[PDB]
């Protein structure tokens, strides 16, 4: 029996994301019109099981958290997906110590990984950011989070 497929997620799993050549967005609808760092060709890693795939190769309509389909949020007529995760999402410049902070850096609310997916091989992965602390982009960014509760 193979390992748990990357489409299968459980709360408390560790998610590793790489965002190559990520670029800054001034406003992101799935983040409540707040800044984001997003990548054309990001990659997602489940650290516990060692399974991984490119985000653009993932059929986000059939991705499960705790056995339940992922929350879908439609803003601007675009389907966005929400991978919740306990605590804030920590991201840094790839291979270097310089670090970014999310928009709600000063509060107690957590964050979630957002994916825009077109039915097909085109997905964008969105990470909450407060400003251009890592620059305007393109810039390689690595992020780390721990999968959180199934949203209600």
């Amino acid at each position: 029996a193979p390992a748990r497929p990357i489409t299968n997620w459980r709360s408390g799993d560790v998610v590793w994301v790489t965002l190559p050549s990520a670029e800054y967005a001034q406003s992101q609808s799935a983040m409540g019109s707040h800044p984001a760092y997003w990548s054309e060709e990001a990659t997602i890693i489940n650290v516990a099981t060692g399974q991984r795939a490119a985000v653009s190769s993932i059929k986000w309509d059939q991705v499960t958290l705790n056995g339940k389909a992922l929350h879908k949020e439609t803003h601007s007529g675009l389907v966005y997906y929400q991978l919740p995760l306990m605590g804030k999402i920590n991201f840094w410049q790839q291979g270097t110590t310089k670090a970014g902070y999310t928009y709600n850096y000063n509060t107690t609310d957590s964050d979630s990984l957002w994916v825009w997916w077109d039915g097909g091989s085109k997905a964008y992965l969105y990470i909450s950011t407060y400003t251009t602390m890592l620059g305007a982009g393109p810039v390689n960014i690595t992020g780390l989070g721990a999968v959180g509760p199934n949203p209600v």
Partner: antibody, heavy 125, light 110 residues
Framework: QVQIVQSGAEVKKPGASVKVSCTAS????????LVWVRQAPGQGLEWMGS????????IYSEKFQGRVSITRDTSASTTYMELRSLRYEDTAVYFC??????????????????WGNGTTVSVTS | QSVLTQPPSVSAAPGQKVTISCSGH????????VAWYQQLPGTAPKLLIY???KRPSGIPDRFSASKSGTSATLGITGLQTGDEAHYYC???????????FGGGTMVTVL
């Protein structure tokens, strides 16, 4: 591919309302922002104001009290710059460029990668 | 009266090196990122450097830049004659809320 085309050269009088337009093609109009920079005959680059092609948000230079308005037309994929009460100092080449970044919070980063060839505005008599 | 003061002009022999300086005032450069542009005579400005050291895909390796403290530095290793252009540094200023440009620097191969 990516291109930005501006209007033609303009000759005006002391006190007028110039409107210079910048049409962009080859990319998603709302994905990026647009800037407006003027350059006098002998002078450097002077930022005038930016626009948000998605939310029509605008910032301006405080050099002009109120004389500048930047407007977008998403359907026509063009931006418009307006100047008012012209004197013999608005005589400059006016550049429209594509914005990458654009934050004004203190860790701010923003550059212009695709430029227009500019429009020459003259204020004479 | 440019906020980001630059040398008016620099020069080097063909194949030599030039460094272009760009002084700030600790509200411009010390905190924010800096971009570099070059303008050939009678043409549109061109992107050279963004995010204080990054090159767009069309710029060769001769152009390198870095920023330390209140000043940012642009350099060209190998000065071909086709580099007769003005060079500008740009960053945000918080005191005067603007995208201030550098004053320009005309490099001449002579």
């Amino acid at each position: 591919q990516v291109q930005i085309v501006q209007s033609g050269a303009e000759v005006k009088k002391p006190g007028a309302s110039v409107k210079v337009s910048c049409t962009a093609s080859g990319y998603t109009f709302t994905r990026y922002g647009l800037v407006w920079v003027r350059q006098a005959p002998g002078q450097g680059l002077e930022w005038m104001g930016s626009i948000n092609t998605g939310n029509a948000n605008t910032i301006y230079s405080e050099k002009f009290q109120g004389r500048v308005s930047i407007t977008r037309d998403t359907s026509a994929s063009t931006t418009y710059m307006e100047l008012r009460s012209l004197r013999y100092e608005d005589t400059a080449v006016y550049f429209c460029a594509r914005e990458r970044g654009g934050s004004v919070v203190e860790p701010a980063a923003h550059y212009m990668d695709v430029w227009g060839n500019g429009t020459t505005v003259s204020v004479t008599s | 009266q440019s906020v980001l003061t630059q040398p008016p002009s620099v020069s080097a022999a063909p194949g030599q090196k030039v460094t272009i300086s760009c002084s700030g005032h600790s509200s411009n450069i010390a905190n924010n990122y800096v971009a570099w542009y070059q303008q050939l005579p009678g043409t549109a400005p061109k992107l050279l450097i963004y995010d204080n050291d990054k090159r767009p895909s069309g710029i060769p390796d001769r152009f390198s830049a870095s920023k330390s403290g209140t000043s940012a530095t642009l350099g060209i290793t190998g000065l071909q004659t086709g580099d007769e252009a003005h060079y500008y540094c740009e960053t945000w200023d918080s005191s005067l809320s603007l995208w201030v440009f550098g004053g320009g620097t005309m490099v001449t191969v002579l």
